Tab-separated table of C-alpha atoms in Angstrom:
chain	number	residue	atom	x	y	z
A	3	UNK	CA	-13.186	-6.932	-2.089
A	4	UNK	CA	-12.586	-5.797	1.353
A	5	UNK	CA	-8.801	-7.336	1.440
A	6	UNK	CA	-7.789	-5.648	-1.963
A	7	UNK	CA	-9.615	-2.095	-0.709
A	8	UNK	CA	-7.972	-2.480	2.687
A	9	UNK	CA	-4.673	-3.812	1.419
A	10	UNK	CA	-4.703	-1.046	-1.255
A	11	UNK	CA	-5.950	1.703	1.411
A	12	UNK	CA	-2.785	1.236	3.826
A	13	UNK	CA	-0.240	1.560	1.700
A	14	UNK	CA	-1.627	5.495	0.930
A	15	UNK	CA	-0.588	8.069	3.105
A	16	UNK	CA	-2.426	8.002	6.658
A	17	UNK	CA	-3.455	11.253	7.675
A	18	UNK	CA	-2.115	12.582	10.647
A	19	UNK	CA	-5.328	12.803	12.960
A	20	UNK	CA	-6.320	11.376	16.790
A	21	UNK	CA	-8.271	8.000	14.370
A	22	UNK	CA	-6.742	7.146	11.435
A	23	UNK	CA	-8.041	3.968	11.114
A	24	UNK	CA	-11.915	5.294	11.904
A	25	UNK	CA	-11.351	7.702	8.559
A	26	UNK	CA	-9.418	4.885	6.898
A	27	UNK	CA	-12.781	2.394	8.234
A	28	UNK	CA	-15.224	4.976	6.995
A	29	UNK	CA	-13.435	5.200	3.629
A	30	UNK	CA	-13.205	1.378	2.947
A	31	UNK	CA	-16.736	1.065	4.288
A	32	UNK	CA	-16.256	-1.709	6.877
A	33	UNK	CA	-16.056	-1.117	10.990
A	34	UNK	CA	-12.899	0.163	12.140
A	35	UNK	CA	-12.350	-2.719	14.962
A	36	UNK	CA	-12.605	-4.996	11.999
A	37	UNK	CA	-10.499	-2.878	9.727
A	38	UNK	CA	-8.023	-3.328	12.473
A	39	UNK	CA	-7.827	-6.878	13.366
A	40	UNK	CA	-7.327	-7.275	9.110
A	41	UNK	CA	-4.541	-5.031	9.119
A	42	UNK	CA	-2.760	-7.262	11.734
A	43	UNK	CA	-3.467	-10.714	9.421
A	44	UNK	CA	-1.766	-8.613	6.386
A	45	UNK	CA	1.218	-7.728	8.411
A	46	UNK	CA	0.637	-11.518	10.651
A	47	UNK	CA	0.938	-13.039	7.036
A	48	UNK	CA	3.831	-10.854	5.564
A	49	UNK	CA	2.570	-9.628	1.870
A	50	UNK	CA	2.955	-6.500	4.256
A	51	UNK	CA	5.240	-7.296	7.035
A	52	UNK	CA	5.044	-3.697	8.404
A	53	UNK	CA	3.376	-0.098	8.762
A	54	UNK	CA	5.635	2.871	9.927
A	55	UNK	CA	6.313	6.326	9.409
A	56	UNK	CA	8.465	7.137	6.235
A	57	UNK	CA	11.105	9.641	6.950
A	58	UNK	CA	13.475	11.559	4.480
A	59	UNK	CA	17.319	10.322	4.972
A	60	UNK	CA	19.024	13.776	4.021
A	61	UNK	CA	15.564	15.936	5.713
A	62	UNK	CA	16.877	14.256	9.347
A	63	UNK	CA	20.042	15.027	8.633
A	64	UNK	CA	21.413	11.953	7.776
A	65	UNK	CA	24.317	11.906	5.299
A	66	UNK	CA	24.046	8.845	2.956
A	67	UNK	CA	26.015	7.535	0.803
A	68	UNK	CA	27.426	3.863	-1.177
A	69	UNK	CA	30.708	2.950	0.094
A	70	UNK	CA	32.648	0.460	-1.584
A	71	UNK	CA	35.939	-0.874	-0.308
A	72	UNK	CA	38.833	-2.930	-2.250
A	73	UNK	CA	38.853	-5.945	0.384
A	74	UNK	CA	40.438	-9.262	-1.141
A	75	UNK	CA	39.043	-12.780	-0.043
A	76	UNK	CA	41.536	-13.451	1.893
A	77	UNK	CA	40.258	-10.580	4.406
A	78	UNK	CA	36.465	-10.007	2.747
A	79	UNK	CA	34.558	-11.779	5.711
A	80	UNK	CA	36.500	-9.889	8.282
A	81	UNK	CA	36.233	-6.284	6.438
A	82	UNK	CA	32.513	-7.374	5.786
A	83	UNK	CA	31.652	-8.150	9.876
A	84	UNK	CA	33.869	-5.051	10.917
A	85	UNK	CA	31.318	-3.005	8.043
A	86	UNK	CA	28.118	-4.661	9.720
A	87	UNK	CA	28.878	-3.511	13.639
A	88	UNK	CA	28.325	-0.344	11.952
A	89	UNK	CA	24.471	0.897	13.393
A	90	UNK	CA	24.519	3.154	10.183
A	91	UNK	CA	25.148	0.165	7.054
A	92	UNK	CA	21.904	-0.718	5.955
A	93	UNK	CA	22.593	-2.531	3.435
A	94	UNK	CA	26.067	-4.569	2.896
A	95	UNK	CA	26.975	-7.190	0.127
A	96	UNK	CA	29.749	-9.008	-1.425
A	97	UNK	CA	29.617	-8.003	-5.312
A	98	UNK	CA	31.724	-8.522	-8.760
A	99	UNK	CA	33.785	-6.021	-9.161
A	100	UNK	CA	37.750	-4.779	-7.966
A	101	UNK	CA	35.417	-3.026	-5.125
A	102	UNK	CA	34.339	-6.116	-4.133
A	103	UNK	CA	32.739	-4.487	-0.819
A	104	UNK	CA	29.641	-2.413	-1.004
A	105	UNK	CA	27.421	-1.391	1.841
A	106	UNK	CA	25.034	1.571	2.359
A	107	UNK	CA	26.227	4.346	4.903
A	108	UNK	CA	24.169	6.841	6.967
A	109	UNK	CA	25.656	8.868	9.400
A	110	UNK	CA	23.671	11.100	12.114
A	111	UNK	CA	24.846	15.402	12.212
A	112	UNK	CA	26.881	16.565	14.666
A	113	UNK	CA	29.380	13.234	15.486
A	114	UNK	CA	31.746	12.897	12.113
A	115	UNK	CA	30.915	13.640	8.659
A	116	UNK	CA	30.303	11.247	6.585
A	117	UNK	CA	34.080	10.870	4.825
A	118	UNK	CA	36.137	11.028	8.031
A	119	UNK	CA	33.733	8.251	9.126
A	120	UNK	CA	34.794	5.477	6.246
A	121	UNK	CA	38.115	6.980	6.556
A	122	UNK	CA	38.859	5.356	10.242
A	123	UNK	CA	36.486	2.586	8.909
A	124	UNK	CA	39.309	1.903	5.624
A	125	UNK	CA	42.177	3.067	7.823
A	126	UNK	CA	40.983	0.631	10.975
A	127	UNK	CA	40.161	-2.112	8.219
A	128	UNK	CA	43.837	-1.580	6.332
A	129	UNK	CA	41.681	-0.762	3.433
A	130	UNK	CA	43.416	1.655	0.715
A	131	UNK	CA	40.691	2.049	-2.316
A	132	UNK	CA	37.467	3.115	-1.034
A	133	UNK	CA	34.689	4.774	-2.818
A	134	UNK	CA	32.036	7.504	-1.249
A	135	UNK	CA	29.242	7.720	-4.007
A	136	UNK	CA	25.888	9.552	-3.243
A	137	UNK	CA	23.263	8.519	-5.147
A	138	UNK	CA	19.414	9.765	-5.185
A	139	UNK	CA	16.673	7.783	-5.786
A	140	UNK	CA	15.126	7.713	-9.953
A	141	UNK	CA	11.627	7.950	-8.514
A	142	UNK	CA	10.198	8.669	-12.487
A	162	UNK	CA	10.971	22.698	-2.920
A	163	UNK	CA	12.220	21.074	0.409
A	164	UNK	CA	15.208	22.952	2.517
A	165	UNK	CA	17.236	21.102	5.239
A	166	UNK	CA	16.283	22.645	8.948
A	167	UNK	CA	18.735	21.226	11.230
A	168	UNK	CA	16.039	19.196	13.740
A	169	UNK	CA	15.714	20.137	17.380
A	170	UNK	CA	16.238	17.713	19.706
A	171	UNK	CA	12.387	17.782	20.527
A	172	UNK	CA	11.865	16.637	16.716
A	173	UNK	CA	14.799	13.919	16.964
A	174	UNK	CA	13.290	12.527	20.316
A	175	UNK	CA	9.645	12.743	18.078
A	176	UNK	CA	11.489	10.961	15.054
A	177	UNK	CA	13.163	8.468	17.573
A	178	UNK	CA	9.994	7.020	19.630
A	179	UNK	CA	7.589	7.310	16.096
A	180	UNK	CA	9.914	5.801	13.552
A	181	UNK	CA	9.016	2.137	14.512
A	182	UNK	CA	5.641	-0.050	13.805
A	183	UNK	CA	2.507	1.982	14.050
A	184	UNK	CA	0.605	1.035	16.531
A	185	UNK	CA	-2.623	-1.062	15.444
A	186	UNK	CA	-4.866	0.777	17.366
A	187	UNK	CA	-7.870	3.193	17.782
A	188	UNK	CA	-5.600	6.234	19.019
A	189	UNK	CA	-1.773	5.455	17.892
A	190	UNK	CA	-0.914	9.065	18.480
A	191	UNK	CA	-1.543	8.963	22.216
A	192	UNK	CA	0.995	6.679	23.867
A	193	UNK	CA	3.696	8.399	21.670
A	194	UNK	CA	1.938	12.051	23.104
A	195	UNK	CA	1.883	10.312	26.615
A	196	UNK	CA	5.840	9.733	26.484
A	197	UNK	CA	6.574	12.884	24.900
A	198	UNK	CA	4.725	14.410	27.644
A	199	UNK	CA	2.267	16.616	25.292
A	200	UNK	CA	-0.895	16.380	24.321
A	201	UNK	CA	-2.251	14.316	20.868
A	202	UNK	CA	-2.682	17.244	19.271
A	203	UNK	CA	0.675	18.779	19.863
A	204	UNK	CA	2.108	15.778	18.626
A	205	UNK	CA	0.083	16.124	15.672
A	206	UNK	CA	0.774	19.838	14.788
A	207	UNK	CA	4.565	18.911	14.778
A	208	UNK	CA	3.660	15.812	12.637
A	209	UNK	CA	2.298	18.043	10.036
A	210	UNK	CA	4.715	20.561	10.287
A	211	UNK	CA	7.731	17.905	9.475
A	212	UNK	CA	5.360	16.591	6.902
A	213	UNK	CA	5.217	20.024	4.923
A	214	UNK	CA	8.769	19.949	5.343
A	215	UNK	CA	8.921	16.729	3.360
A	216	UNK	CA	10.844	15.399	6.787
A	217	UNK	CA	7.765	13.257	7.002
A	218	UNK	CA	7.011	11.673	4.270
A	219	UNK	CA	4.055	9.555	4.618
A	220	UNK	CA	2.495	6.729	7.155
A	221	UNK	CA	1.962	3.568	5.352
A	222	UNK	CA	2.483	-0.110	5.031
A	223	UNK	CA	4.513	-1.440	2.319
A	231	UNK	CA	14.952	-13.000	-6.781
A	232	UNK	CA	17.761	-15.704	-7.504
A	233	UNK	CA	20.587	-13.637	-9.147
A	234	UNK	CA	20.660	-9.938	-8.209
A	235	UNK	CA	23.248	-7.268	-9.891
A	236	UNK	CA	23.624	-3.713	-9.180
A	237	UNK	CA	23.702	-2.342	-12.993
A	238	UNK	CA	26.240	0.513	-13.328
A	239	UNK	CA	26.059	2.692	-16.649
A	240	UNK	CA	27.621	5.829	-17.821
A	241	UNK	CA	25.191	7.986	-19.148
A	242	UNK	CA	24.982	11.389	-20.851
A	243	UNK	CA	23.145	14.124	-18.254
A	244	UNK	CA	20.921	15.363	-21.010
A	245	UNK	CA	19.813	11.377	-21.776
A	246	UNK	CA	19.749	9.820	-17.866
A	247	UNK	CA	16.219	11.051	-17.836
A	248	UNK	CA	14.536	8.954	-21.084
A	249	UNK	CA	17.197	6.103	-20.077
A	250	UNK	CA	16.136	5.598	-16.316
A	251	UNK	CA	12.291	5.722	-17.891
A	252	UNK	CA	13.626	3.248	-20.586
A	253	UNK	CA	15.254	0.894	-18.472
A	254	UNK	CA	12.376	1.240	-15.770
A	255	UNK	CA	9.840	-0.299	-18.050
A	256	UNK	CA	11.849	-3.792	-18.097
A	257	UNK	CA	11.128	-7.133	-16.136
A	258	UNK	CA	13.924	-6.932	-13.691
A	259	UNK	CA	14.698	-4.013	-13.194
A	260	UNK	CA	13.789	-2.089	-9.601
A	261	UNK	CA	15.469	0.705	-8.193
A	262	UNK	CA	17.433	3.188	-10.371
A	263	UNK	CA	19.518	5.981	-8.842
A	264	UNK	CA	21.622	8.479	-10.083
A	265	UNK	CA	24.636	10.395	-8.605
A	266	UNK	CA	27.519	12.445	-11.201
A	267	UNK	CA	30.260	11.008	-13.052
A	268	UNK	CA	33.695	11.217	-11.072
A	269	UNK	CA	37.318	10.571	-11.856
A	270	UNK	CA	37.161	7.487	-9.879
A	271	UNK	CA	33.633	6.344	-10.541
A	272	UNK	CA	32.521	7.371	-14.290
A	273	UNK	CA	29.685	5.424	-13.714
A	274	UNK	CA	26.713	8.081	-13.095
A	275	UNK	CA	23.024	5.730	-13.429
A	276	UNK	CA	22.863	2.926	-11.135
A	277	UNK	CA	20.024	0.456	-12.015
A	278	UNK	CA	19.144	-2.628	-9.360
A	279	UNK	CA	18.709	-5.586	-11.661
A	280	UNK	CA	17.315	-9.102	-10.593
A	281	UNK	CA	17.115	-12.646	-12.729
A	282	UNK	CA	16.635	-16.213	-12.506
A	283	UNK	CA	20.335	-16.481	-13.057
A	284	UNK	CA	23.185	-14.150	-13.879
A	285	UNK	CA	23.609	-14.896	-18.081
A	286	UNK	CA	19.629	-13.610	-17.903
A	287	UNK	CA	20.597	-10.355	-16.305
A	288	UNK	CA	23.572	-9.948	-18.708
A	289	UNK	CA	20.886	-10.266	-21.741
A	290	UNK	CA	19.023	-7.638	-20.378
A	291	UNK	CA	22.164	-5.695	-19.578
A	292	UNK	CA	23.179	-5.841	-22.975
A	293	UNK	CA	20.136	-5.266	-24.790
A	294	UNK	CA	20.097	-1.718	-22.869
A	295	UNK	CA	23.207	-1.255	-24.158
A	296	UNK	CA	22.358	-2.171	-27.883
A	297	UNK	CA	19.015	-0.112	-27.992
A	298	UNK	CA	20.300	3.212	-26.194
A	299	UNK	CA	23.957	2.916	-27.452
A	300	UNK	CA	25.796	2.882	-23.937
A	301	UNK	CA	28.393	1.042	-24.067
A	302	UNK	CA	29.965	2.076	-21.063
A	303	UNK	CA	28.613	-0.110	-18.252
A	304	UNK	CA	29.000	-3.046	-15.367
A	305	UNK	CA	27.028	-5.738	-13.718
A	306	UNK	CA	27.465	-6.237	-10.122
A	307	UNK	CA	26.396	-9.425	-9.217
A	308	UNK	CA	25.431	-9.178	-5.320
A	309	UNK	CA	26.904	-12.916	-4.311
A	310	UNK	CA	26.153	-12.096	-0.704
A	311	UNK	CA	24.349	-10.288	1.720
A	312	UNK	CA	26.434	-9.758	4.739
A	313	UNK	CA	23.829	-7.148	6.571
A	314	UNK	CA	19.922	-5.903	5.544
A	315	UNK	CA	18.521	-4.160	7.955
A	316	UNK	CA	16.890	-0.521	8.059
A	317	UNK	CA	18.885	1.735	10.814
A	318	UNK	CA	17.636	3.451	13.839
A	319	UNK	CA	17.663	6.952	13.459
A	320	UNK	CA	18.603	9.012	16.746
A	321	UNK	CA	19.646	5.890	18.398
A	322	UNK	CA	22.682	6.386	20.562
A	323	UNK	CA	24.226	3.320	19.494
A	324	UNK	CA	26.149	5.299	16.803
A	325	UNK	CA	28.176	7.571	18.318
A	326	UNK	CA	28.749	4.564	21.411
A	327	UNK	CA	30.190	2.923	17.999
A	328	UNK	CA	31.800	5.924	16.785
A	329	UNK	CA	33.574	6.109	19.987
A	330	UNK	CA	35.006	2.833	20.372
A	331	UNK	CA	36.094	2.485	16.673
A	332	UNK	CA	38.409	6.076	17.572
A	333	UNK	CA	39.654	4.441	20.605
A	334	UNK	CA	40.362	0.905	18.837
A	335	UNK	CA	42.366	3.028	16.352
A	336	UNK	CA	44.539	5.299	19.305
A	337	UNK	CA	46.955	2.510	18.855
């Protein structure tokens, strides 16, 4: 079928050439005009809603990490609005737990690190337990070049939808003021630096799982809880005095008491009896950031002068 070889096709890497789509058209077997108006009824219709470049956090570097703040009700919705201005939470949620607060945090180089950041954040919010947990993707050698400004400016104007069309390298090219195949060459270069990754197209009750784990076991664990029904993303980060909690599994059900089952069968099979499920109740803020945006640091600023009295 032409949908399931074109659907399939898009979400592989596309090379980084002057026509993509006239190799990707050749390989599927159909004429690329056509190839092209299908793409736009996949992404039209939303079983893909997008195709973009896929760039490495950490590789731009971004510092990431998952904050969670001790907010009570009383001032939750406030704390969690304040958390959302932020252009660098991604992700933000209300969840079960004394940190009732957890969002995702990336921070551009050069403005603040990362920890001085959530500390004007907690200290602006009257917030007294935080936590600053880094976590890296279970997805089961690359060295961080501080980018030119060239590269961010190249990471800025690329990063959004991919254009649907016979030569989406040249209006990026034509505003970067090179030619197509300069653009390409630095493409490929941030692409062997695993900066690039690729080019492609990609419940009721939700719980962030939360298990302490022995280093020498995370490995078969993460592979034995990846092979369950509800279970998605699993990330790991090291144990800490105020977090022992070390492999973080995303867990979805049609209802919480499900999710527990699960939760506890884990812990009956692979003895770990050290764990917590939290339940996401809401979503304050899911969006994917900007990078190189200047919107940042314009927020940066104004959160240091809020806090100068």
């Amino acid at each position: 079928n032409e949908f399931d070889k074109i659907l399939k096709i898009i979400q592989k890497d596309i090379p980084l050439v002057k026509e993509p789509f006239s190799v990707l058209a050749q390989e599927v077997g159909i004429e690329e005009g056509k190839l092209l108006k299908t793409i736009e009824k996949l992404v039209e219709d939303g079983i893909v809603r997008h195709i973009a470049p896929i760039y490495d956090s950490r590789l731009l570097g971004y510092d990431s990490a998952l904050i969670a703040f001790k907010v009570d009700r009383q001032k939750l919705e406030e704390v969690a609005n304040f958390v959302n201005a932020c252009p660098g939470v991604s992700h933000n949620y209300e969840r079960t737990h004394d940190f009732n607060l957890w969002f995702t945090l990336a921070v551009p180089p050069e403005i603040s690190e990362l920890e001085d950041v959530v500390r004007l954040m907690a200290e602006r919010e009257r917030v007294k337990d935080y936590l600053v947990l880094r976590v890296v993707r279970l997805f089961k050698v690359y060295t961080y070049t501080p980018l030119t400004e060239e590269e961010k400016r190249i990471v800025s104007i690329t990063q959004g939808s991919f254009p649907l069309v016979e030569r989406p390298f040249l209006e990026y090219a034509k505003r970067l003021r090179m030619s197509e195949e300069e653009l390409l060459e630095k493409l490929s270069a941030l692409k062997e630096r695993g900066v690039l990754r690729r080019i492609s197209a990609v419940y009721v009750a939700n719980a962030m799982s939360v298990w302490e784990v022995p280093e020498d076991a995370i490995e078969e664990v993460g592979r034995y809880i990846a092979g369950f029904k509800g279970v998605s993303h699993c990330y790991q980060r090291t144990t800490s005095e105020k977090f022992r909690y070390n492999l973080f599994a995303m867990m979805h059900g049609k209802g919480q008491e499900e999710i527990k089952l699960l939760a506890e069968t884990i812990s009956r099979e692979k003895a770990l009896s050290k764990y917590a499920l939290l339940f996401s109740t809401r979503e304050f803020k899911k969006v994917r950031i900007k990078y190189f945006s200047e919107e940042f640091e314009r927020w940066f600023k104004e959160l240091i002068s809020a806090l100068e009295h």
